[PDB]
């Protein structure tokens, strides 16, 4: 039997905002260690990878590893039912055709039980070796999202160009062109890097934006961009985006 109790449930809530939009079905891997979700979006051009560490919860219980087939849309709809200040608890049996979600008001007076029909899927997981990045940017969550919001009203991709004292995002389009130069902003750059990404996908990622006040962008020549939102003393959401290529 699995049992996670997270006292500060606004967190499960944000994680589904941050996923439901990019992908609508995923497979929650549960274990001694924690939760693990990895899915590619539907074109295979982008991928999300979630970690929630056991030591991250208020209460954690696992007796048999689990791959739960979850409809993300359905789960966000149920989660959208939670009070920003509810204690939330995920429960499921090994039988398993049914994941429970419980919302208990901090006075133990209101308590909701929403139990979710599960699913079954094959899902191409992906090998993702630990690697160094030839350049890395810390930045305010918010500022990254406006930058992507902004720029996508001019053009549909962003050249992210990195320097040892500046990051520049630029876009190009029918109405003309634009760029934004950025000198809590920090660049750790083993060498310069310039690469071009699709603003659609980036605009899904920035949704995780309510999970953290900082975001890092990791990139190198011809390897997917990584955008990481660290969930306070608990884990992360990391998104991968393949660089745009000559047509």
């Amino acid at each position: 039997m699995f049992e996670a109790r997270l006292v500060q449930g606004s967190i499960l809530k944000k994680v589904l905002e941050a996923l439901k939009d990019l992908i609508n079905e995923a497979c929650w891997d549960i274990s001694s260690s924690g939760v693990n979700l990895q899915s590619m979006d539907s074109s295979h051009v982008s991928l999300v990878q979630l970690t929630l560490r056991s030591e991250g919860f208020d209460t954690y219980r696992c007796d048999r590893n689990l791959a739960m087939g979850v409809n993300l849309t359905s789960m966000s709809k149920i989660l959208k039912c939670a009070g920003n200040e509810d204690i939330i608890t995920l429960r499921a049996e090994d039988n398993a055709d049914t994941l429970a979600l419980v919302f208990e008001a901090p006075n133990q007076e209101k308590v909701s039980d929403y139990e979710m029909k599960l699913m079954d899927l094959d899902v191409e997981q992906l090998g993702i070796p630990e690697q160094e990045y030839s350049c890395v940017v810390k930045m305010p969550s918010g500022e990254f999202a406006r930058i992507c919001r902004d720029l996508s009203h001019i053009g549909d991709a962003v050249v992210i160009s990195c320097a040892k004292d500046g990051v520049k995002f630029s876009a190009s389009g029918e109405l003309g062109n634009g760029n934004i130069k950025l000198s809590a902003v920090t660049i750790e750059m083993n060498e310069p890097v310039q690469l071009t990404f699709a603003l659609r996908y980036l605009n899904f990622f920035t949704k995780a934006t309510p999970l953290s006040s900082t975001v890092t962008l990791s990139m190198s020549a011809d390897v997917p961009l990584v955008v990481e939102y660290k969930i306070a003393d608990m884990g992360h959401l990391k998104y991968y985006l393949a660089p745009k290529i000559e047509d």
């Binding site: 090998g127 393949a242 290529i245």
Partner: peptide, 11 residues
């Protein structure tokens, strides 16, 4: 104008 992540990471 993009390539799939299977290009970059192995299943």
């Amino acid at each position: 104008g993009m390539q799939t992540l299977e290009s970059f990471f192995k299943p």
